[PDB]
C-alpha cells in the first residue's frame, strides 16, 4: 500500500508546486525568476495590497470625473 500512498502524495505535491509556479508568474516582480516559496507568498501579498490601493485610487478619480462631466452636460 505504501508504494501507492507514496505515488498519490507525490502527485499531490506536484500540483501544489505547479500552483506556486502559477502564482509566482502572476506577480510582476517575480515572473520569470527563481523565487523560493517564501518569496512568492510575500511578494504576492505585497502586490495584492498594492493593486487594491491602486484600484481604489482610480475608482475615486472615476467618480471625480463623472461628477465633473455630468455637471458640464447641464451647463451645455
Amino acid at each position: 500500500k505504501r508504494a501507492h500512498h507514496n505515488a498519490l502524495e507525490r502527485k499531490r505535491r506536484d500540483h501544489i508546486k505547479d500552483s506556486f509556479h502559477s502564482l509566482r508568474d502572476s506577480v510582476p516582480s517575480l515572473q520569470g525568476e527563481k523565487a523560493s516559496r517564501a518569496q512568492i507568498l510575500d511578494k504576492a501579498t505585497e502586490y495584492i495590497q498594492y493593486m487594491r490601493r491602486k484600484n481604489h485610487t482610480h475608482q475615486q478619480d472615476i467618480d471625480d470625473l463623472k461628477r465633473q462631466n455630468a455637471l458640464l452636460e447641464q451647463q451645455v
Binding site: S22, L23, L41, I48, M51, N55, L65
Partner: protein, 79 residues
C-alpha cells in the same frame, strides 16, 4: 547533529506557515468557516490577483474615456 537540521527545517516551515496565513487573511478566500488545503489558497490568490489586474485595466480605460468626454464638453461649452 540531526536535531540541528530537523530543528532548522521545522523553523523554516513555521515561517512559511506565517506567510501563508497572512495571504489567507487577504483575499475573500471563502465565506464562513474557511479551508486551507494550501492548494485552495494558492488558487484563490492567483485568481484574485487576476481580477485586480483586469479591474485596473478597465479603470485606466474608463478614466481615459471620461477625460476625452470632459475635453469635448469643455470645447463645446465654448460655442
Amino acid at each position: 547533529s540531526r536535531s540541528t537540521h530537523n530543528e532548522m527545517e521545522k523553523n523554516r516551515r513555521a515561517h512559511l506557515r506565517l506567510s501563508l496565513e497572512k495571504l489567507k487573511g487577504l483575499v475573500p478566500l471563502g465565506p464562513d468557516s474557511s479551508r486551507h488545503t494550501t492548494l485552495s489558497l494558492l488558487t484563490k490568490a492567483k485568481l484574485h490577483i487576476k481580477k485586480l489586474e483586469d479591474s485596473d485595466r478597465k479603470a485606466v480605460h474608463q478614466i481615459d474615456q471620461l477625460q476625452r468626454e470632459q475635453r469635448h464638453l469643455k470645447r463645446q461649452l465654448e460655442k
